[PDB]
Paper text:
Cytoplasmic dynein-1 (dynein) is a highly conserved molecular motor that moves toward the microtubule minus end, transporting various cargoes including RNAs, membrane vesicles, and viruses, and plays a crucial role in cell division. Dynein belongs to the ATPase associated with various cellular activities (AAA+) family of proteins. Its heavy chain features a motor domain composed of six AAA+ modules, a long stalk, a microtubule-binding domain (MTBD) located at the end of the stalk, a buttress region that makes additional connections between the AAA5 module and the stalk, and a long tail that interacts with dynactin and an activating adapter. Lis1 is a dimer (~90 kDa) with an amino-terminal dimerization domain and carboxy-terminal β-propellers that bind to the dynein motor domain24,25. Our data support a model in which Lis1 relieves dynein autoinhibition by increasing its basal ATP hydrolysis rate and promoting conformations compatible with complex assembly and motility.
Numbering used by the authors:
A (entry chain A): 2270 to 2361, 2366 to 2466, 2470 to 2681, 2686 to 2786, 2788 to 2860, 2869 to 2894, 2898 to 2941, 2960 to 2980, ...
B (entry chain A): 3322 to 3431, 3435 to 3458, 3460 to 3473, 3477 to 3501, 3505 to 3532
C (entry chain C): 139 to 210, 218 to 237, 241 to 261, 270 to 349, 356 to 391, 398 to 494
Write the structure that this text describes.
Amino acid sequence: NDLVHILGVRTFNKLETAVQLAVHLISSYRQWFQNLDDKSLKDVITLLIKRSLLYALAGDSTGESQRAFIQTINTYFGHDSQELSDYSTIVILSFSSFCSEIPSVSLEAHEVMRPDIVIPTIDTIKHEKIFYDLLNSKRGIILCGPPGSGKTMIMNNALRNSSLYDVVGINFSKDTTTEHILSALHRHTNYVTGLTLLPKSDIKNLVLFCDEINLPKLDKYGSQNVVLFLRQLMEKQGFWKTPENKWVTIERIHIVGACNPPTDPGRIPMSERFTRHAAILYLGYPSGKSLSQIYEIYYKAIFKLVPEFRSYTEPFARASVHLYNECKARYSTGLQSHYLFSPRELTRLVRGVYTAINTGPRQTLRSLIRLWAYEAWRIFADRLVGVKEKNSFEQLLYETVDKYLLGNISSTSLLFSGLLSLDFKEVNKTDLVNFIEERFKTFCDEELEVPMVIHESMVDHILRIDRALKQVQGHMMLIGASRTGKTILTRFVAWLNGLKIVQPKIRHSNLSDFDMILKKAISDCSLKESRTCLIIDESNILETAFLERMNTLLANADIPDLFQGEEYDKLLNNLRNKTTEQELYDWFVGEIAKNLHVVFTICDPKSSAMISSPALFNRCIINWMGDWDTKTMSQVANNMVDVVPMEFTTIRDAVVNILIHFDRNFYQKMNPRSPGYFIDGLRALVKLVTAKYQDLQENQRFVNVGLEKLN
Amino acid sequence: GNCIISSIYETYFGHLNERERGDMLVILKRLLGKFAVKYDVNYRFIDYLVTLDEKMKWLECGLDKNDYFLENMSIVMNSQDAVPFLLDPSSHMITVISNYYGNKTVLLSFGFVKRLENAVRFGSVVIIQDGEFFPIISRLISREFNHAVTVEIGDHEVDVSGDFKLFIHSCDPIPIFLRSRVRLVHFVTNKESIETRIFDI
Amino acid sequence: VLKWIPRNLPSCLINVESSVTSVKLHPNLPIVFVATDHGKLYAFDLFNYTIPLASLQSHTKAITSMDVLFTNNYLVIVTASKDLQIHVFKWVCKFQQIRSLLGHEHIVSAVKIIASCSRDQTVKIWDFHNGWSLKTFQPHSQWVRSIDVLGDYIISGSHDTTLRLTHWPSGNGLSVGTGHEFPIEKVKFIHFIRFRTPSTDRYKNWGMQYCVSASRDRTIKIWEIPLPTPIPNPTDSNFRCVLTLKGHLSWVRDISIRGQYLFSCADDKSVRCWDLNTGQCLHVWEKLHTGFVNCLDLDVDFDSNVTPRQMMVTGGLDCKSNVFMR
Ligand SMILES: Nc1ncnc2c1ncn2[C@@H]1O[C@H](COP(=O)(O)OP(=O)(O)O)[C@@H](O)[C@H]1O
Ligand SMILES: Nc1ncnc2c1ncn2[C@@H]1O[C@H](COP(=O)(O)OP(=O)(O)O)[C@@H](O)[C@H]1O
């Protein structure tokens, strides 16, 4: 009772899970004990009892807490009984360990892109086995832990690789209801006599996977409804038909939940009334050695593509795991609401190294380390707040490279592009700025009539967003001061890459119209292979259900709710016009991941809950646009006033830097600073100086004509 | 010197009252003296951008004798490159622009999209009270067009008459995207207002 | 004599004040004219490139492109400017203003002969003799970029990647074509004398079977022209491709074809010459300009009136041009 727990329940209410798991284990093993002695039988029974007690009383604790519990449960039953450890397992009977049960697989390069690829390791298979037992024990499941632990990944691993079970994926929104669940089960269950609801299959049970159950919001009287609905299904073993008013009994269904800890902002604490009937497990962060093995396997699978340095997999695995460890160490979420670190971004780092290697020329050692460092700058040190932590990251990269086995490492000097040629390689600054200038001038002459500047900070950001866009599942968050040019940057990179711009023209709008626009975009993407990029501003979002839909498609690789019925019928008809159920849906997932890219242009750091959502952190490459710098704006002002010759008594530098100084004083006398005031001032000054200097020029010309006539 | 003062006065001091605007002016003039640029010691922007005949033209429609209101509608009329914004809980800017234009002033509030489409088709000036209820107009307030001139309002292309002006007014003492594009003008009386008023009286 | 390939090193370099946008040599005299984006026309003798023979400024805005034509006799020099003015001068060794033209409401892009293309959405056709307005037409719902005239037929590719073939007396679109994902930068007919080998007698009477197209997506595509009836054929008015040509590292600006070896220029500091038979790049010239290679020009091998001499010339954005002899 006195140890640490999450979702604190009474100790009276875990005995259900403990006893039911133990009895199911004994009923599964019973028909093998007929040829066993009394002592071996008693040892097996006490081993299973100890395992049930440990995994039903300390399931919501951490690894060191679990080891303290295992030593206390060893010393509280005496040493005569069979001992239980972290790796202990009963299997054909004989005492064994989990360490000899893991499989071995060596995947090649072209399937690392799949988000559902599951790597085998020790904790994964241990939680797999306990998940199997606890699901077969006719008991509800909830998994809670820090973000990035792989709850959805472990769920898909356990549910896809079972012949007795299937998967139905539903994701809750901020505003939920009861027909979400009925709609999710509508495509996979049928009503039979509807007195009884059963899965469409007959031999395999169907389990409802719901994730982020903390997300739904309470009403004004301190009570939600969806968790009570879940409690009614997984306790009463039935529910009430809302329009028909009859009891509907469900027997082979199961309820499994995934959620964040209640300490996360925007995540409510549930009543113990619902968690009473379920079984809770803590899914913590994997240990250092487990991550080391996982990324060793990943780096071996990625250096299969470059066979010259196959023996250098192990130092890079140590460097990546260690670097993640002190990257989580030196700052946390207590300083800012976006410093959330997880294995997700290390996986995406491996993905970026993959696409850079595959889409690149012949590589050597120093090129490979500098590419790795550039990707580390790309994905780890991209949403920070100052340059001190940036140079700390640089020296951190230096020390981990020299301790795990040079050239420049800094991202400002390492310039990797894909527009200068057909391969992803090192490029030339002059060539890139010339190409960007030519592209912008032809864009201005063609479509958008803004006589607008090009400078080094914005071309660097263009490179940033182009690198983020060229990848698959490439969705990036642009947060910066207003009128900095994020929307124009997105339009420019879409024009250069080839993606066409679509925008939602929103109150005076609804879910029906927005999903009609979405379905039109989806149909165009599926039929014409249309490259779609959609631009959302602050005014384009009013309901949190929109963000829930993008969060669903982003945390997952797809939308498992809005693609159903006659829409599926016409979609498959058109696809078979162009061309199994699971394979067809997987190819749909792949093509919609390769042919869709969402951008958010949000300036306010609903938006606070948007950034704070760690599910939204999954496939968002949060790029810190930030505010302008004094040197950067001196450059842009010098470029802007160059078209207006005004040197009279140079003075252009003096006027631009004194204007800079005045607005610095104004900001200090009155958080981000919006550069709209600056650009409005520069434009007004330029137009007024030009117009009134022309007027004074013709006035002085008339005066000179009069003076020449009178002299 | 007077031109840089005029530009920075019309773009930076729209939402500042007399005391802090005087502090900003004296700090800016000290900065100009630091940077050693020629200017005018005895210069006022009202003496620059307000013509006496047009001053009387605004005077015959509800102009107040306070110089704060003078610089207020001077900044309003000088906002040509950007759309103007009128912050007034007392509802006086709407009245003065309505009786200064006349039938040109078309009064709308937040079928508003159809009314706005008709207004931009006929070239009609539109003023909305309670601008916090604001998106259709977003392209027009960004002032970016598809040259033929055409207007891609909503989902159906339209044509701009060429004589269109757009004013937005509110009363609550605002989206940041809206705020950046607009020219915010303050009309709240404070201690500096009563200071100057009793001093001149 | 028709299978000449220029050497790698440039013969000499014409230094220009601003970026070169159009180059054209005199078919008769050994002189060349370069028109820039600053409204500047520089005339340079082909064997005397030291001093500018004629540095003229008659254009307020940029000159995108220009060409010349010999009367059937003097030479016509047609120049254009983005302020919607078209000029025709007289070469004595100076430019003498012969005539001016108007009728375009926006920036003019290119000229052909006199006809011209612009960005003002309207196709307008005048006469050099008359100088008045004769023909107006709308090519597509979206405006075209590259046009040309071959007797009485015009092919046009628009910003929406739409090719249309029209006939001046009939006034109807003979065929429609498409296939790229990007707007077409240049489209050109292919005539006969595998591209110059006719297939049937009907197409021998026609003379056009293939056509080349270049865009900014680093692709060169040759398109088959469907059989027309004049009156259009609804069932025989669709283009089709047979070979995709690539190799450029940037946008393809302009293309030129002669014999079997075709020349192209791209923004990757390079000019590449290919063969239409094997598809392998016969030569890649690198480092021609510090800026992008904007335009190419050679003696017109497709016209027997002009002598296809031993000359080549290219322009660039680096305020310089390279002319190749020997
Ligand atoms: N130990 C691990 N082994 C392999 N992949 C992992 C591991 N941990 C995390 N991942 C990656 O993280 C993703 C799972 O994210 P998850 O933690 O389910 O998101 P959320 O925190 O929103 O539930 C998977 O796509 C997987 O590739
Ligand atoms: N480099 C730039 N410097 C200053 N202003 C710019 C720049 N690029 C674009 N803008 C202006 O910003 C507007 C678009 O701003 P946007 O990118 O939407 O800002 P945000 O993304 O912060 O809302 C355009 O109308 C343009 O006039």
